[PDB]
Amino acid sequence: SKLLELLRKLGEALHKAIELLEKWG
């Protein structure tokens, strides 16, 4: 359950990073 929670947060970070990349790109 804790490992899953981490995967979720990495997934949330990755998504936000990609959204920033398009705003800048």
Least distance to a second copy, CB of residue 19, Å: 6
Count the residues of the shown chain that bind a second copy, applying the rule CB under 8 A. Answer: 25
Q: How far is the CB of 23 from a second copy (least distance, A)?
A: 7
Q: For the CB of residue 25, give the shortest distance to a second copy in the complex, in Å.
A: 5
Between CA 20 and CA 3 the distance in angstroms is 26
The angle subtended at Cα 11 by Cα 9 and Cα 16, nearest 5°, is 95
Q: If you ran DSSP here, which 8-state letter would residue 1 be given?
A: -
Binding residues for a second copy, rule: CB under 8 A, are: 1-25
